Enzyme design. Structure first.
Site, PDB file in Angstrom:
ATOM      1  CG  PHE A 231      66.737  14.829-108.928  1.00 51.51           C
ATOM      2  CD1 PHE A 231      66.360  16.159-108.717  1.00 51.51           C
ATOM      3  CD2 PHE A 231      66.333  14.202-110.096  1.00 51.51           C
ATOM      4  CE1 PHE A 231      65.573  16.831-109.641  1.00 51.51           C
ATOM      5  CE2 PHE A 231      65.568  14.875-111.032  1.00 51.51           C
ATOM      6  CZ  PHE A 231      65.180  16.186-110.799  1.00 51.51           C
TER       7      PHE A 231
ATOM      8  CG  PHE B 292      63.460  17.921-102.939  1.00 51.64           C
ATOM      9  CD1 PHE B 292      64.019  19.178-102.691  1.00 51.64           C
ATOM     10  CD2 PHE B 292      63.681  16.894-102.020  1.00 51.64           C
ATOM     11  CE1 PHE B 292      64.772  19.407-101.558  1.00 51.64           C
ATOM     12  CE2 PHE B 292      64.435  17.127-100.880  1.00 51.64           C
ATOM     13  CZ  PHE B 292      64.975  18.390-100.651  1.00 51.64           C
TER      14      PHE B 292
HETATM   15 CU1  CUA Z   1      62.794  12.254-102.290  1.00 53.46          CU
HETATM   16 CU2  CUA Z   1      61.357  11.961-100.059  1.00 53.46          CU
END
Ligand code: CUA
Ligand code: HAS
Ligand code: HEM
Ligand code: OLC
Ligand code: OLC
Ligand code: OLC
Ligand code: OLC
Ligand code: OLC
Ligand code: OLC
Ligand code: OLC
Ligand code: OLC
Ligand code: OLC
Ligand code: OLC
Ligand code: OLC
Ligand code: OLC
Ligand code: OLC
Ligand code: OLC
Ligand code: OLC
Ligand code: PER
Ligand code: CU
Lengths: 166, 549, 31
Positions: A84, A86
């Site tokens: 995802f 991050f």
């Molecule tokens: Cu998640 Cu690049």
């Protein structure tokens, strides 16, 4: 001279075109080999397997990352990974060494990479689809996940961890 | 000029092309230092204040360098060259239409690009959602090629009409197969743009299926890179021989290459989708095999082209196994650029071949290896080829002459360019082998890839070398442009002669059956893409767009 | 005969081979 040079050039280009053809084939044969071996686990299952990226974190095998690891054989485990923005759940992923690990990885936003450093596991993760790969970790320890597909500004720092248990 | 108005249109396609290369390229030395773990983005932001992120630059760089410049050049070469060979005039109305379509599409796409509104990189994968102006501007730009396709098929038939029972002249055969191949290839992205990208960005639909879009994209995706390479090949094939001091060793061998690129350029696109889910391995194995085939024509080119040079060099007194190399016209940059480009193309395709082999792709996919590989391809061989055309095309087009000093500056740019691309190619391949991801602002996470300290130095060095090369090219380009001498405008294009051996009339005629090959090529696309696309459209699953910048 | 051409394709082959065999080693190392 021009008559002679042309005769030889063409005569020899043909040899080369056959040799290069042969070499290309021998490669093909060597790619086919790997196709027949356990190292081909990392090729994604080309089966479509759609899911819903909006609800995936609320219902399903991705809603509870503490339960993402599931034994499916006497020596095989399935891990449910959410790549995802991050990062990745779970963190870390823990599996035992020598077990076959079926990674079932999906996104809830954009596309990320799931590239397990030090391994052959390198698979694009697309929102709406489950990406399935197989690996058996040989050495115990800590492997790093890197996102190798641009996923917005948080990209360079987007990492995860797999911990293989001796 | 009032008798060769194709010259002016060709001129514009070149200059705008070069402009785009310059602007795009400004971002390169910065990405170079980035992959050398050095952060110079601060500096650049003072200098170009609209630039908001490393990634905004990476969008501009790819879009302007790899999409805009390359195509303009393809258009500039693959219309004019055949037009001059046949000594016939293009449809000037059409010829201008295409330029304006490109210029208009480009301006429109540049607006959201420059506005940080479509920072998605040149591949623009959903569900990352850019501004509608980007996709439309992109579409209108790319569609400009359809007008070029027409012009050249036009020219072609008119010539045939005036000359039935005659084989298509070389350059024109190359150009025609080129365009015809591009048409098929272009459908993928058109489809993606029209069925998916445009409606979405306009808001007609809520989400897009990321897999189907990646699939449709990579339809066009791969053969676009041959569409990029071929105009350079055209020059290397039908001109370089004369600049080198010899002749093209085989007319039919050149045609065979090109014919192969028509049949084998499009049906190979899963090679970009080896790490994609929902695409059957059997089809991947197919596409990988077919990809390997499409290496053949370049492999063939390698020999045809090398032999042509050996011949060129022997005519200039070269004696020995190496003698011919030193005998070649190395003081002439029009000659040097492409040769150097072909040189770096050895390691280039060598990596292409690896990339193509399926399971081996997992070793290198989405790492710095990739960019390291392809800069030898497009950013070197093609770019260099287009650079040395300054020294023979530009004077041909504008009457303006190449001074002695300007020539020397040319050699410099070319050489330092080629060297920078080598150096960077080392650092990146090496770094990708250490797992350093492509498309990452890695210099902002400076403690992340310590094992990659060696190759990083090559990156940095390459950065500064290539900044000097770019700077030099800017100065030089504008020194040629803002300079008319009479015979330089009317004197012929350095089209090489062909060596004298009975050719294969039987094959040359077969190859000339173009209607047939075009259909064959198309059938292959249906066979290779068809099944997967049907299954993918059957089970579409669109998803919300995101803006993560 | 075209010694130079042959020479060039000799360099081409070796490169391809070093490149290919190299990555294949690395594939099996990470396997
Ligand atoms: Cu998640 Cu690049
Ligand atoms: C200009 C544009 C490009 C061309 C042409 C190109 C050719 C190929 N490529 Fe590629 N491509 C791939 C495979 C190949 C293969 C098999 C070839 C072939 O055409 C190669 C044939 C070439 C040869 C076998 C070389 C022959 C040598 C010659 C012709 C030189 C001879 C030298 C002479 C004669 C000099 C003599 C001089 C003297 C004086 C001595 C694959 C996978 O199968 C990947 C995906 C990687 C991944 O996982 O993402 C890929 C990735 C890309 C990307 C990244 C796209 C992205 O952003 O994701 C770019 C931009 C690109 C560009 C280009 N590449 N390629
Ligand atoms: C001064 C020369 C230039 C330098 C130093 C340079 C450097 C860079 C670097 C380091 C990257 C990788 C960035 C990353 O992966 O994060 C890159 C990618 C890119 N470059 Fe360039 N390059 C230059 C010129 C060119 C030109 C001439 C083109 C082709 C015409 C080009 C084509 C590409 C493409 C297509 C990308 C990929 C962009 C993406 O992943 O979205 N390069 N370049
Ligand atoms: C790399 C080797 C490929 C080079 C190809 C060498 C093949 C030999 C060949 O074709 O030789 C023709 C000649 O007529 C026979 O003496
Ligand atoms: C240009 C010249 C290029 C120079 C070559 C450098 C590439 C070397 C090796 C890559 C092969 C990777 C092999 C990976 C095995 C290491 C491993 O197992 O490390 C992970 C471990 O889990 C951590 O605890
Ligand atoms: C958007 C407006 C399009 C711009 C139109 C300008 C096109 C001018 C052009 O190139 O055409 C010459 C023509 O003969 C006319 O003077
Ligand atoms: C001809 C020139 C422009 C066409 C006008 C196009 C105008 C359409 C704009 C649609 C728009 O702005 O919709 C964004 C929406 O929020 C979804 O992302
Ligand atoms: C340039 C593209 C503009 C128009 C193309 C045609 C667009 C026609 C609009 C189709 C959208 C539609 O019917 O929407 C599907 C909806 O998601 C199901 O409920
Ligand atoms: C050109 C036509 C010739 C094409 C020949 C390729 C045919 C079958 C490949 C076998 C596919 C099997 C690969 C599956 C790998 C696997 O077991 O994935 C987990
Ligand atoms: C890490 C790598 C970075 C270093 C870059 C190395 C790459 C190869 C460089 C040049 C190839 C040129 C080979 C051919 C030599 C051309 C010069 C020549 O033959 O010149 C004749 C001379 O002028 C008498 O007239
Ligand atoms: C060993 C370590 C070295 C690090 C690399 C340094 C890089 C560039 C320095 C300058 C190189 C400039 C080369 C220009 C060559 C040139 O222009 O020569 C034309 C020639 O006469 C035939 O065409
Ligand atoms: C063309 C010449 C290019 C580069 C010169 C070689 C530079 C390579 C040396 C790198 C040394 C370095 O940066 O240190 C390594 C590491 O940190 C030790 O602990
Ligand atoms: C005139 C022609 C001469 C051409 C030069 C020869 C090539 C050698 C070095 C390039 C120097 C670039 C290195 C810049 C600094 C490297 C750096 O960033 O250092 C970090 C260190 O390696 C990690 O701790
Ligand atoms: C045209 C091509 C010319 C090629 C010349 C190569 C560049 C410089 C070489 C001298 C080496 C000097 C390196 C000493 C400084 C290294 C250092 O400490 O790095 C920078 C610092 O961190 C601040 O960011
Ligand atoms: C348009 C695609 C077809 C091109 C081949 C073709 O049919 O060309 C015959 C020509 O009309 C006669 O010279
Ligand atoms: C025309 C240009 C032709 C240049 C390209 C030639 C190919 C490779 C050169 C790189 C050298 C070979 C790399 C050795 C691999 C290596 O270092 O292996 C790692 C091992 O673990 C030990 O540490
Ligand atoms: C331009 C310059 C291009 C550089 C690319 C050069 C060579 C790639 C060959 C692959 C390198 C293979 C080295 C790793 C190796 O041999 O390792 C296997 C070992 O069993 C466990 O690490
Ligand atoms: C005269 C005509 C003769 C032409 C023969 C070509 C010989 C070359 C390659 C054969 C490929 C051998 C395939 C063996 C694959 C086994 C392998 O690579 O095994 C390593 C791996 O570690 C295991 O797990
Ligand atoms: O794309 O090669
Ligand atoms: Cu490709």
């Amino acid at each position: 001279d021009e008559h002679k040079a042309h005769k030889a050039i063409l005569a020899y280009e043909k040899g080369w075109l056959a040799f290069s053809l042969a070499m290309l084939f021998v490669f093909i044969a060597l790619i086919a080999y790997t196709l027949a071996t356990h190292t081909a686990g990392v090729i994604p299952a080309g089966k479509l397997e759609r899911v819903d990226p909006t609800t995936v974190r609320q219902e399903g095998p991705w809603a509870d990352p503490a339960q993402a690891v599931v034994q499916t054989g006497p020596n095989q485990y399935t891990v449910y990974v959410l790549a995802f923005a991050f990062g990745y759940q779970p963190n870390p992923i823990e599996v035992p060494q020598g077990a076959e690990i079926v990674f079932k990885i999906t996104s809830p936003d954009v596309i990320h990479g799931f590239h397990v450093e030090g391994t052959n596991i390198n698979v694009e993760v697309l929102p709406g689809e489950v990406s399935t790969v197989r690996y058996t970790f040989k050495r115990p320890g800590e492997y790093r996940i890197i996102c190798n597909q641009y996923c917005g500004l948080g990209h360079q720092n987007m990492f995860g961890t797999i911990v293989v248990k001796e | 000029y009032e008798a060769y108005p194709e010259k002016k249109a060709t001129l514009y396609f070149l200059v705008l092309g070069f402009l785009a290369l310059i602007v795009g390229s400004l971002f390169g030395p910065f990405q170079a230092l980035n992959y050398g773990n050095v952060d110079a983005y601060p500096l650049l932001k003072r200098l170009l204040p609209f630039v908001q992120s490393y990634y905004q630059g990476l969008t501009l760089h790819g879009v302007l360098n790899a999409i805009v410049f390359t195509q303009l050049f393809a258009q500039a070469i693959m219309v004019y060259l055949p037009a001059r060979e046949l000594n016939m005039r293009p449809n000037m109305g059409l010829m201008w239409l295409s330029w304006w379509m490109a210029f208009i599409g480009l301006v429109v796409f540049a607006l959201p690009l420059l506005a940080n509104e479509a920072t998605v990189l040149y591949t623009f994968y959903p569900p990352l959602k850019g501004h509608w102006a980007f996709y439309l501007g992109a579409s209108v730009f790319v569609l400009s090629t359809w007008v070029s396709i027409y012009i050249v098929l036009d020219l072609w038939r008119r010539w045939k009409a005036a000359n039935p029972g005659k084989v298509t002249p070389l350059v024109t055969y190359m150009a025609v197969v080129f365009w015809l191949m591009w048409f098929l290839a272009s459908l993928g992205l058109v489809l993606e743009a029209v069925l998916f990208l445009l409606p979405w960005s306009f808001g007609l639909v809520e989400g897009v299926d990321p897999l189907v879009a990646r699939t449709l994209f990579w339809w066009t995706g791969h053969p676009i890179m041959y569409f990029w390479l071929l105009p350079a090949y055209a020059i290397i094939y039908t001109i370089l021989p004369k600049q080198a001091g010899g002749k093209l060793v085989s007319d039919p061998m050149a045609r065979l290459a090109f014919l192969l690129f028509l049949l084998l350029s499009t049906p190979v696109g899963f090679h970009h989708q080896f790490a994609d889910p929902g695409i059957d391995p059997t089809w991947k194995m197919i596409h990988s095999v077919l990809t390997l085939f499409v290496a053949v024509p370049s492999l063939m080119t390698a020999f045809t082209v090398a032999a042509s040079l050996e011949f060129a060099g022997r005519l200039r007194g070269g004696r020995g196994l190496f003698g011919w190399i030193r005998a070649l016209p190395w003081d002439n940059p029009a000659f040097v650029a492409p040769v150097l480009g072909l040189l770096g193309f050895i390691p280039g395709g060598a990596g292409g071949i690896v990339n193509a082999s399926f399971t081996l792709d997992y070793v290198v996919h989405n790492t710095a290896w990739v960019p390291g590989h392809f800069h030898l391809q497009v950013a070197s061989l093609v770019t260099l080829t287009a650079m040395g055309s300054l020294y023979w095309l530009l004077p041909n087009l504008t009457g303006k002459p190449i001074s002695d000093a300007q020539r020397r500056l040319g050699l410099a740019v070319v050489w330092l360019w080629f060297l920078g691309m080598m150096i960077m190619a080392v650092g990146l391949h090496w770094a990708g082998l250490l797992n350093v991801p492509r498309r990452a602002y890695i210099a902002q996470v400076p403690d992340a890839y310590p094992h990659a300290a060696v190759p990083m130095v090559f990156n940095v060095l390459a950065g500064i070398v290539l900044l000097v090369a770019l700077l030099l090219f800017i100065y030089g380009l504008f020194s040629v442009l803002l300079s008319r001498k009479p015979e330089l405008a009317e004197a012929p294009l350095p089209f090489a002669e062909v060596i004298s051996g009975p050719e294969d009339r039987r094959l040359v005629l077969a190859m000339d059956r173009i209607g047939f090959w075009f259909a064959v090529a198309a059938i292959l696309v249906v066979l290779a893409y068809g099944p997967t696309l049907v299954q993918l459209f059957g089970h579409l699953n669109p998803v919300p767009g995101w803006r993560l910048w | 005969k075209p010694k130079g051409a042959l020479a060039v394709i000799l360099v081409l082959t070796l490169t391809i081979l070093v490149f290919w065999l190299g990555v294949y080693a690395v594939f099996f190392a990470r396997g």
